[PDB]
Each structure stands twice: as C-alpha cells, then as structure tokens.
Amino acid sequence: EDLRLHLLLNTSVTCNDGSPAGYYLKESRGSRRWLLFLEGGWYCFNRENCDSRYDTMRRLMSSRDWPRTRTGTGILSSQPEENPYWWNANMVFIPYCSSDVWSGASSKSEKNEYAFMGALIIQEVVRELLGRGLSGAKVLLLAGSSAGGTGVLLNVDRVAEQLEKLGYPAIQVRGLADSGWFLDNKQYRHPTEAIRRGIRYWNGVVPERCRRQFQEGEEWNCFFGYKVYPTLRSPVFVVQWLFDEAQLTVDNVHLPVQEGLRLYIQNLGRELRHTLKDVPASFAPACLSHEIIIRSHWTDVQVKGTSLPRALHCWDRSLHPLKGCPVHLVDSCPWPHCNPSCPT
Numbered sequence: 001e002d003l004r005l006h007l008l009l010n011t012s013v014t015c016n017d018g019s020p021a022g023y024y025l026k027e028s029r030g031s032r033r034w035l036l037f038l039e040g041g042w043y044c045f046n047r048e049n050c051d052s053r054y055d056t057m058r059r060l061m062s063s064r065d066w067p068r069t070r071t072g073t074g075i076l077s078s079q080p081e082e083n084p085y086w087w088n089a090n091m092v093f094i095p096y097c098s099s100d101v102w103s104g105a106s107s108k109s110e111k112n113e114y115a116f117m118g119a120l121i122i123q124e125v126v127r128e129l130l131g132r133g134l135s136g137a138k139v140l141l142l143a144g145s146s147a148g149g150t151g152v153l154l155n156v157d158r159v160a161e162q163l164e165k166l167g168y169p170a171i172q173v174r175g176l177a178d179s180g181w182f183l184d185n186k187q188y189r190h191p192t193e194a195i196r197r198g199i200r201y202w203n204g205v206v207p208e209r210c211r212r213q214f215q216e217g218e219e220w221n222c223f224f225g226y227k228v229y230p231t232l233r234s235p236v237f238v239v240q241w242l243f244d245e246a247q248l249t250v251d252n253v254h255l256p257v258q259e260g261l262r263l264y265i266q267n268l269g270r271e272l273r274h275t276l277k278d279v280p281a282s283f284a285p286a287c288l289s290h291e292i293i294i295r296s297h298w299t300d301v302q303v304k305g306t307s308l309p310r311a312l313h314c315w316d317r318s319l320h321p322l323k324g325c326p327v328h329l330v331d332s333c334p335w336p337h338c339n340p341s342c343p344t
C-alpha cells in the first residue's frame with residue numbers, strides 16, 4: 001500500500017462520471033527518476049456499452065470507490081528484488097477511468113452523458129506533480145499496459161511538448177509501451193471500427209505528426225503502434241508478446257490445432273516480428289500471454305538470455321550498441337511458448 005491516492009486539485013479533469021481523476025504516488029527523495037504508469041482496461045465507444053461498463057466495471061469509470069492506497073508491483077515496486085530496473089524511482093500509478101484509450105478531451109455536459117478526458121488527465125497529473133518534485137526530474141518514463149500501453153504511444157510526445165512549453169526542457173521524456181502494440185489484421189473468424197466510432201464519441205486526439213499523415217477521418221490509424229511509432233520523437237521501448245491474448249481475442253481465436261489455425265497463429269507472430277524489426281528498443285517474447293511490467297514475476301521471462309529489467313537498464317545506458325547489454329530482443333521461434341521462459 002505504498003502509493004498514496006491524490007485526487008486532482010483541478011476537479012474539472014474528471015473520470016467518465018464527472019468524479020475527479022487522480023494518481024497514486026510514492027515519492028523517492030533524492031531520485032531524479034519518475035515513472036508514470038497508465039493503467040489499461042479496454043474502452044467503451046457508445047452510450048449503451050458505456051452504460052454497461054458503468055454497471056460492472058465502475059472503477060474504470062469513476063473515482064468514487066477508489067482506495068486510499070495501492071501496492072506498487074513489478075516495475076512499480078520499490079523493492080530491488082522485485083524491480084531490478086527502477087526500484088528507487090518516484091512511482092506514479094495513474095488509474096484508467098476515461099474509457100478512451102487515454103485519447104479523450106471531452107467534458108461531461110448537457111450533450112455528453114460521460115466525460116472522456118484521458119489525454120487531459122495525463123497532462124494534469126504531470127502539471128500537478130511538478131509542484132511535488134517532478135520539476136527536479138532528469139527522466140520521466142511514461143509507461144503503461146494494454147490500453148495504457150497504447151496510451152503511451154498516443155501521449156508521450158505531448159508530455160514532452162507540455163514540459164518544454166512549461167519551461168522544463170531538461171526533463172527527458174521517454175515511453176514504455178507494454179501490450180499496446182496491436183495489428184489491424186483480418187480476424188480468424190468473423191477494433192478499427194470501434195476505435196473509429198470511439199474517437200468521434202470521445203473527441204479523441206492523436207499525435208500531431210501521425211494526424212497529419214493520415215488526415216481527417218483516418219485518425220484511428222494512429223492507435224496502431226506500427227503506424228504511430230515511426231512518427232514519435234521521444235524514445236519509446238516497446239514490450240509486446242508475439243501471441244498477445246488480447247490480440248487473439250479481437251481476432252476471434254480461442255485456444256488440437258488444425259492447419260488453418262496453425263497457419264493463422266504462425267502468420268500473426270511473423271507479423272508481429274516484422275513490425276518490430278525497425279524498433280531498436282523492444283522486448284517481444286514468443287508467448288501466449290498478456291501484460292508484463294506490473295506483474296510481480298515480470299523478472300522471469302527472458303529473450304535470448306536477457307530479462308526485461310536488464311533490457312530496460314541497457315536502454316537507459318544507450319540513452320546516456322553495448323557489449324553484452326542488448327536492447328532489441330525479439331524472439332524468432334514461431335509458436336507460443338517455444339521460449340522456455342514464457343509464463344505458465
């Protein structure tokens with residue numbers, strides 16, 4: 001319970017239901033490293049599916065029932081045995097309560113049942129943290145899992161742009177996108193369309209260079225990592241299971257596998273591996289799983305003999321190739337769990 005809740009002092013930056021958004025914070029005085037983690041949890045794209053989400057997933061739409069504390073786990077742990085990478089950093093967990101893949105900039109109003117303010121929540125958290133020690137940071141790592149991982153890709157350059165405009169050009173803004181690198185591929189049996197409808201429903205915003213490439217009506221393209229990543233200026237480390245369970249879910253794959261499905265699964269991993277070929281900081285194990293960075297046993301998986309905490313440390317060193325300390329770690333074996341270190 002080591003991170004303490006702070007609801008946003010600007011109570012107009014709200015969760016879906018108009019309750020104030022917030023963040024959980026554990027300060028580490030003397031550390032100039034700040035980790036801001038974006039929670040995931042899918043999204044909702046119209047009044048009717050948002051109403052259903054409000055009935056049975058309300059913590060993802062409201063702060064009314066949030067606990068006063070949370071325990072930092074995985075990359076958010078302050079214990080060096082659990083977090084070899086950044087155990088001494090200032091830890092921030094930003095709850096996902098906007099249902100908009102962290103892209104929205106719309107308030108609840110006469111015409112809007114729900115507020116979708118994910119992009120503004122991030123910017124307000126950053127602004128309020130500056131008075132709490134973030135002004136002295138040397139590195140701000142914006143991390144996230146699942147919808148939060150996509151949120152990193154959508155927001156990392158805006159955070160960098162915010163800090164420059166606020167007069168803090170010495171803070172190095174970086175991104176860590178976990179399990180948010182998806183493919184707009186063909187389903188195995190019969191997301192782009194839901195993201196398309198969602199952006200309109202949310203007033204969703206995408207990075208500016210990506211917006212300018214794809215232009216009006218096509219901003220949904222920027223929710224897909226392989227399309228938005230090349231447009232980003234901030235350093236971004238991409239973590240993605242080659243056979244992500246959420247990718248298979250949207251592909252209508254549910255796991256004695258016959259030839260058609262075997263070929264589909266192998267092609268997906270290849271598509272995967274191909275989109276990461278030009279991503280120099282990446283960690284992509286050949287496993288059927290979902291998320292990594294805030295799991296307590298995130299240290300266990302290895303690609304080519306290197307763990308993710310090591311790869312992230314090598315990435316830090318690279319931002320000061322390195323002998324025995326690699327940053328590009330993508331499995332080449334073609335089937336789930338061909339890497340023996342995959343989670344059970």
Ligand SMILES: O=c1[nH]nc2ccc(Sc3ccccc3Cl)nn12
Nearest residue numbers: 040041042146147150182191223246
């Ligand atoms: O939070 C979780 N867990 N698994 C998933 C899968 C997709 C999403 S949103 C999304 C993001 C980028 C592209 C397409 C979509 Cl649809 N969020 N999510």
Ligand SMILES: *[C@@H]1O[C@H](CO)[C@@H](O)[C@H](O)[C@H]1NC(C)=O
Nearest residue numbers: 010011012013120121123124
């Ligand atoms: C509160 O947040 C809203 C939305 O970002 C912004 O328009 C407003 O100016 C903020 N208020 C203050 C006092 O910063």
